[PDB]
Design an enzyme around this catalytic site. Structure first.
Site, PDB file in Angstrom:
ATOM      1  N   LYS A   1      -2.407  -5.994  -0.851  1.00 51.92           N
ATOM      2  CA  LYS A   1      -3.491  -5.636  -1.745  1.00 51.92           C
ATOM      3  C   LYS A   1      -3.559  -6.484  -3.010  1.00 51.92           C
ATOM      4  CE  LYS A   1      -2.292  -2.300   1.084  1.00 51.92           C
ATOM      5  NZ  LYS A   1      -3.499  -1.580   1.575  1.00 51.92           N
TER       6      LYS A   1
ATOM      7  N   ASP B   1       8.485   2.799  -1.746  1.00 50.11           N
ATOM      8  CA  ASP B   1       7.426   2.123  -1.006  1.00 50.11           C
ATOM      9  C   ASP B   1       6.486   1.605  -2.089  1.00 50.11           C
ATOM     10  OD1 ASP B   1       5.602   1.130   0.817  1.00 50.11           O
ATOM     11  OD2 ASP B   1       4.973   3.054   1.604  1.00 50.11           O
TER      12      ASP B   1
ATOM     13  N   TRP C   1       1.137   8.692   3.103  1.00 50.35           N
ATOM     14  CA  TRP C   1       0.506   7.776   4.036  1.00 50.35           C
ATOM     15  C   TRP C   1       0.968   8.264   5.413  1.00 50.35           C
ATOM     16  CZ3 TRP C   1       2.675   2.549   6.002  1.00 50.35           C
ATOM     17  CH2 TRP C   1       1.710   1.919   6.809  1.00 50.35           C
TER      18      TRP C   1
HETATM   19  C1  LIG Z   1      -2.259  -1.080   7.407  1.00 47.67           C
HETATM   20  C2  LIG Z   1      -3.496  -0.198   7.386  1.00 47.67           C
HETATM   21  C3  LIG Z   1      -3.462   0.870   6.301  1.00 47.67           C
HETATM   22  C4  LIG Z   1      -3.840   0.309   4.935  1.00 47.67           C
HETATM   23  C5  LIG Z   1      -3.561   1.235   3.752  1.00 47.67           C
HETATM   24  N1  LIG Z   1      -2.118   1.632   3.710  1.00 47.67           N
HETATM   25  C6  LIG Z   1      -1.231   0.406   3.636  1.00 47.67           C
HETATM   26  C7  LIG Z   1       0.053   0.946   3.032  1.00 47.67           C
HETATM   27  C8  LIG Z   1       1.371   0.416   3.256  1.00 47.67           C
HETATM   28  C9  LIG Z   1       1.624  -0.796   4.152  1.00 47.67           C
HETATM   29  O1  LIG Z   1       0.576  -1.659   4.416  1.00 47.67           O
HETATM   30  P1  LIG Z   1       0.790  -3.201   4.721  1.00 47.67           P
HETATM   31  O2  LIG Z   1       1.694  -3.224   5.910  1.00 47.67           O
HETATM   32  O3  LIG Z   1      -0.573  -3.690   5.118  1.00 47.67           O
HETATM   33  O4  LIG Z   1       1.588  -3.853   3.735  1.00 47.67           O
HETATM   34  C10 LIG Z   1       2.547   0.898   2.710  1.00 47.67           C
HETATM   35  N2  LIG Z   1       2.473   1.981   1.885  1.00 47.67           N
HETATM   36  C11 LIG Z   1       1.271   2.594   1.577  1.00 47.67           C
HETATM   37  C12 LIG Z   1       1.522   3.764   0.637  1.00 47.67           C
HETATM   38  C13 LIG Z   1       0.068   2.058   2.170  1.00 47.67           C
HETATM   39  O5  LIG Z   1      -1.018   2.760   1.774  1.00 47.67           O
HETATM   40  C14 LIG Z   1      -4.402   2.493   3.823  1.00 47.67           C
HETATM   41  O6  LIG Z   1      -5.359   2.690   4.670  1.00 47.67           O
HETATM   42  O7  LIG Z   1      -4.010   3.379   2.885  1.00 47.67           O
END
Ligand SMILES: CCCC[C@H](NCc1c(COP(=O)(O)O)cnc(C)c1O)C(=O)O
Ligand SMILES: CCCC[C@H](NCc1c(COP(=O)(O)O)cnc(C)c1O)C(=O)O
Lengths: 396, 396
Positions: free
Chosen positions: B246, B211, B130
């Site tokens: 999610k 994570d 990410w």
């Molecule tokens: C926040 C916008 C990105 C959303 C999404 N990734 C969100 C995301 C997060 C943390 O998100 P939250 O803070 O909303 O809990 C942590 N870890 C991963 C691997 C993620 O994909 C994506 O586009 O993969």
């Protein structure tokens, strides 16, 4: 990795909540945190807030991500609260607002922004001030220097000492001002002094950073923004961290805002994109609930009207409580004269008590105040006023 | 101060939302952000969530501050979700949890904690990962190094390259693992590999940082925590940043948690106090709403049962969508074989598309995917599947 980690010291303010709750004894009185209380000793959710929440429950169709800077109408409403409806800052698109997790979070993103996209190295915070000011800034790498403010003897704003202290601040330095309801003194500059500070500031090349956490608790919504608006009339750039925790009773929903002002739209847009970059590495996007409540109440004639009245009732109750406080102290036998309490604004009052005195009050009387002698007037009720005042007098 | 500020570059993921919305054209398809969608192309609020919210509306008596670490029951429930009910980590009081503004906020406070109360200087993040992982860590002063992971040719976990890359990590270094649903590859280690990684890790003296943002989206709630639980069985210390964005459809309410694990209660208590110190300088205390929803749903037999079913329906719909995706691609005329898509878990799929291909899809077909070729399978519906697959084939 964690074997050598040393226990962190408790927040003078927040660590108080723990002690208070861990402390038994029924009659215990809590005058610590700046949280409003009604005549019954409860801190309820506003009616206007309950109404907006029901509206959301029935009209909310999704919990989909909110966007870095949060809710737009939320941003538009805060700018009007801060600068006024007519305002050229709004008409010229000189300001951008990001919704944040409280006023604390607005200060942090402001710090993170400055420390990374600016040449600022030092921030000036009044003495005294909200303890957590230093911590937020120190966490971003900035250095915190202090300016004089309170004339403890006469209980006034020592403006000379203020000017003279700030005379050591260079151009490109950040000076933090409390918009109204100075924490913890309750003393605020007059409009004259505000204009004077504005004049000086534009000549010394300081970047004003206003902390607005109590708009509406001194005189009123508009009147409380008079200082800020005077600066904004003369400055090309300024940052303001505001909160909706007290004036909306939304403490735990973390509703606040960081407003960025630049010379023109093109510049502020560029500067803001970096701010959004600072939010993205911190929390992504802000929590919708508390902010949706604020935007819905503000966008609605009826709801806003109800809210404005609830707000003036809180202000007025506090004002009755401090008056009762001063009288009951005299009535109870306090030697010193505490009439200056009546002159302060906001939820607090700098009692002028010593550390050992606040220590004995708690330990011996279960009365909880901050070590600095700051007491939450909005936590005083006609019923706890007497044992409270007796505790105090037996410690003077 | 802001005249020289340079415009920040857009997030490859979030900057996509802007383009998508600013883009007209009805048929435009959005496969960017990892946000769930139902058969109708909407991302609704869960029914269990609506029920918990009504419960709060009628039973909430105050919005008073929540305390640095947030709601206790919230913390207790997350630890059980992560480690299991029996778990000795819970029985020995080796873990402490802080409620945070999302998983992003949990990563930041983890970073802020490590960079200030630890001797860590570098964090290892898989390649790819990410994008925002790097940014959060860089913001805290840590350095980000990368380890190999994806075998692009065979579309598998290149475990040798993984081991060999990590062989360069020293003791006292942090290695970041995605608990399940690897973003953006969708490939995860087996339990064997998880145990192997656990063995190696305890010998090299690495600090594991998991994570967890998609628990329940691969196989199931419990099964998805198998890797994490294997590490926790052997490690004396570990940090886990989890999210409820999610699996609870609470995207905009920012619900997440940072769980700290140490050798014993006394140590974790000491370490945790410093973590709370890091939260205090950032946002004070967390937003109650989304977390109260999670705690109420989890503390209630009926509500939890409804939630668990809604969750398995989301998982299953995605699973039907990727299968349909592969078939329609073949049916539509795609030359390449995309059967490996069926092997991936979570909301995404690493399409294996090139940057110019994803650029043409958007520009020419209004189909939005991330530059890396990551597409949100949970954003595919039986209705947009055809024009989507035609767009793709005409770009291969
Ligand atoms: C926040 C916008 C990105 C959303 C999404 N990734 C969100 C995301 C997060 C943390 O998100 P939250 O803070 O909303 O809990 C942590 N870890 C991963 C691997 C993620 O994909 C994506 O586009 O993969
Ligand atoms: C957050 C706990 C402290 C409450 C209170 N000070 C809260 C507070 C804030 C920011 O608070 P929010 O993040 O909740 O918006 C900003 N500025 C001042 C001057 C404050 O007193 C006090 O004890 O004075």
């Amino acid at each position: 990795m964690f074997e050598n980690i040393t226990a962190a010291p408790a927040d003078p303010i927040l660590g108080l909540a723990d002690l208070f709750r861990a402390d038994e004894r029924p009659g215990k009185i809590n005058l610590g945190i700046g949280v409003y209380k009604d005549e019954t000793g409860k801190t309820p959710v506003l009616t206007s807030v309950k109404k907006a929440e029901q509206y959301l429950l029935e009209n909310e169709t999704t919990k989909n991500y909110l966007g870095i800077d949060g809710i737009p109408e939320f941003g538009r409403c805060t700018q009007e609260l801060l600068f006024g409806k007519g305002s050229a800052l709004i008409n010229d698109k000189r300001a951008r607002t990001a919704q944040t997790p409280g006023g604390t979070g607005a200060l942090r993103v402001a710090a993170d922004f400055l420390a990374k996209n600016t040449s600022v190295k030092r921030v000036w915070v009044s003495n005294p001030s909200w303890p957590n000011h230093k911590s937020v800034f120190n966490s971003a790498g900035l250095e915190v220097r202090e300016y004089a403010y309170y004339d403890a003897e006469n209980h006034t704003l020592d403006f000379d000492a203020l000017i003279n202290s700030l005379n050591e601040a260079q151009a490109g330095d950040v000076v933090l001002f409390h918009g109204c309801c100075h924490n913890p003194t309750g003393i605020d500059p007059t409009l004259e002094q505000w204009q004077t500070l504005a004049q000086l500031s534009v000549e010394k090349g300081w970047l004003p950073l206003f902390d607005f956490a109590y708009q509406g608790f001194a005189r009123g919504l508009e009147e409380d923004a008079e200082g800020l608006r005077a600066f904004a009339a003369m400055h090309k750039e300024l940052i303001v961290a505001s909160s909706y925790s007290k004036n909306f009773g939304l403490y735990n929903e973390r509703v606040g805002a960081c407003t960025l002002v630049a010379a023109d739209s093109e510049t502020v847009d560029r500067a803001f994109s970096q701010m959004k970059a600072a939010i993205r590495a911190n929390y992504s996007n802000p929590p919708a609930h508390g902010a949706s409540v604020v935007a819905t109440i503000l966008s609605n004639d009826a709801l806003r009207a109800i809210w404005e009245q609830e707000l003036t009732d809180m202000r007025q109750r506090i004002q009755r409580m401090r008056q009762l406080f001063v009288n009951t102290l005299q009535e109870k036998g306090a030697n010193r004269d505490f009439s200056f309490i009546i002159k302060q604004n906001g939820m607090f009052s700098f009692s002028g008590l010593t550390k050992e005195q606040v220590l004995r009050l708690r330990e011996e009387f279960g009365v909880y105040a901050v070590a600095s002698g700051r007491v939450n007037v909005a936590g005083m009720t006609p019923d706890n006023m007497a044992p409270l005042c007796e505790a105090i007098v037996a410690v003077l």
